[PDB]
Amino acid sequence: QAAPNRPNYIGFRDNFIGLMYYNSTGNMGVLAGQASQLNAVVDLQDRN
Amino acid sequence: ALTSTPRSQLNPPNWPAAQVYQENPAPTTVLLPRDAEAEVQMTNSGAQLAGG
């Protein structure tokens, strides 16, 4: 006999959830004036 | 006789500290960006100051 295969669609997460590194302190981003590179976006692991 | 400091010997071997061109620069006024007292108080309060 034989059958169909189960279907799996495989597409990118909603609002592209996870594509950018949010909530991960290691790979956090930055947004600072071109001088004084002091970060201005400091993320944590609790604010999800 | 109008551009040479009256010397006692041509090619004197140690020009003293007065007849040689000292360079005075204007005092370097720096704008200390921050007051540490207030920053420490705020960071103790729980804030997490971060930025330029």
UniProtKB/Swiss-Prot annotation, chain A:
Subcellular localization, as worded in the UniProt entry: Virion; Host nucleus
The organism's place on the tree of life at top rank: Viruses
Entry coiled-coil feature ranges: none
Induction profile: Expressed in the late phase of the viral replicative cycle.
Anything else known: All late proteins expressed from the major late promoter are produced by alternative splicing and alternative polyadenylation of the same gene giving rise to non-overlapping ORFs. A leader sequence is present in the N-terminus of all these mRNAs and is recognized by the viral shutoff protein to provide expression although conventional translation via ribosome scanning from the cap has been shut off in the host cell.
Subunit structure: Homotrimer. Interacts with the capsid vertex protein; this interaction binds the peripentonal hexons to the neighboring penton base. Interacts with the hexon-linking protein; this interaction tethers the hexons surrounding the penton to those situated in the central plate of the facet. Interacts with the hexon-interlacing protein; this interaction lashes the hexons together. Interacts with host dyneins DYNC1LI1 and DYNC1I2; this interaction might be involved in intracellular microtubule-dependent transport of incoming viral capsid.
Family the UniProt entry places it in: Belongs to the adenoviridae hexon protein family.
Role noted for this protein: Major capsid protein that self-associates to form 240 hexon trimers, each in the shape of a hexagon, building most of the pseudo T=25 capsid. Assembled into trimeric units with the help of the chaperone shutoff protein. Transported by pre-protein VI to the nucleus where it associates with other structural proteins to form an empty capsid. Might be involved, through its interaction with host dyneins, in the intracellular microtubule-dependent transport of incoming viral capsid to the nucleus.
Full protein name: Hexon protein
Residues of the full protein shown: 294 to 341 of 925
Curated annotation (Swiss-Prot), chain B:
Modified residues (Phosphothreonine): T5
Subcellular location: Virion
Physiological role: Structural component of the virion that acts as a cement protein on the capsid interior and which glue the peripentonal hexons and group-of-nine hexons together.
Protein name as it appears in the record: Hexon-linking protein-N
Organism expressing this protein natively: Human adenovirus F serotype 41 (HAdV-41)
